[PDB]
Amino acid sequence: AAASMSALITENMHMKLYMEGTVNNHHFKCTSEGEGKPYEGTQTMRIKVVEGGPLPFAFDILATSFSKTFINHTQGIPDFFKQSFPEGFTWERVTTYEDGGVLTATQDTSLQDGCLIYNVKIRGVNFPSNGPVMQKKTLGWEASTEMLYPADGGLEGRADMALKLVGGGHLICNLKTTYRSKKPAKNLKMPGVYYVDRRLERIKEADKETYVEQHEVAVARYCDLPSKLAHK
């Protein structure tokens, strides 16, 4: 398995992305391209809003929809995402904001001629017309920890994220995600419960957020604290 993974997921990898969707009633399309180091868990994406720009909502709500192959899996945690190749995997997610916005996203991840290919679809509804997202009072995301746990041959994830607001303070949201491998389960080594620490940062933006550069670093670990019961 390691042999396959090292053949397909190189130390350096490029990605190409297409995104289409609606937020409230506003349609849009985005494309991006980027590169990263899958085993070190770092990556950059350069993103263009190619239709429906400038967006009437804060770009921040799209941030998590632009890359699971780029997680540094430490401590021998089996890598569900890198193992999934060459077949690939999908994810599906609902992000629920505490002021009512709901953003669903589904995504397909494939490997084509040594390049990672993302196809993303977005449908967000009920964002308050006079709230911080629609009025663009946001300033990016705090760091987060996602808990991943095996469920039915795939993985699920849970995270709470804090969106920084102008004037200080935060708007909180919750992420519920299902990660599904296209590789047959017999061929997968499933991890137990683990945690992915992340810091996703906006590096550059231009033209009323119709061009955005994002960088992410992601490191997977167990809980490092000692266990009285001998658990990981």
Residue numbers in the entry: -3 to 62, 66 to 231
Please give me the paper's original passages concerning this structure.
They are widely used for studying biological events, such as cellular trafficking and endocytosis, and have contributed to the development of innovations such as multiphoton microscopy, genetically-encoded sensors, and super-resolution microscopy. mKate, a derivative of eqFP578 from Entacmaea quadricolor, is a bright, monomeric, far-red fluorescent protein with excitation and emission peaks at 588 nm and 635 nm, respectively. Structural characterization of mKate under different conditions revealed the pH-dependent trans-cis isomerization of its chromophore, a discovery that further aided the development of mKate variants with enhanced optical properties.
Mutation S158A disrupts the hydrogen bond that stabilizes the trans-conformation and as a result the chromophore populates the cis-conformation in the mKate variants at physiological pH. As predicted, the chromophore of mKateS158A at pH 7.0 exists entirely in its cis-conformation. The phenolate forms hydrogen bonds with S143 and a water molecule (Wat1), as observed in the structure of mKate at neutral pH. In contrast to mKate structures, residues R197, E215 and several chromophore-coordinating water molecules undergo major structural rearrangements in mKateS158A. The particular conformation of R197 in mKateS158A positions its guanidine group above the conjugated bond between the Y62 phenol ring and the imidazole moiety, presumably altering the conjugated π electron density distribution on the chromophore via a cation-π interaction, as has been proposed for mNeptune. The crystal structure of mKateS158A reveals three potential proton wires. In pathway A, the phenolic oxygen is in direct contact with the side chain of S143, which is hydrogen-bonded to R197 through a water-mediated interaction.
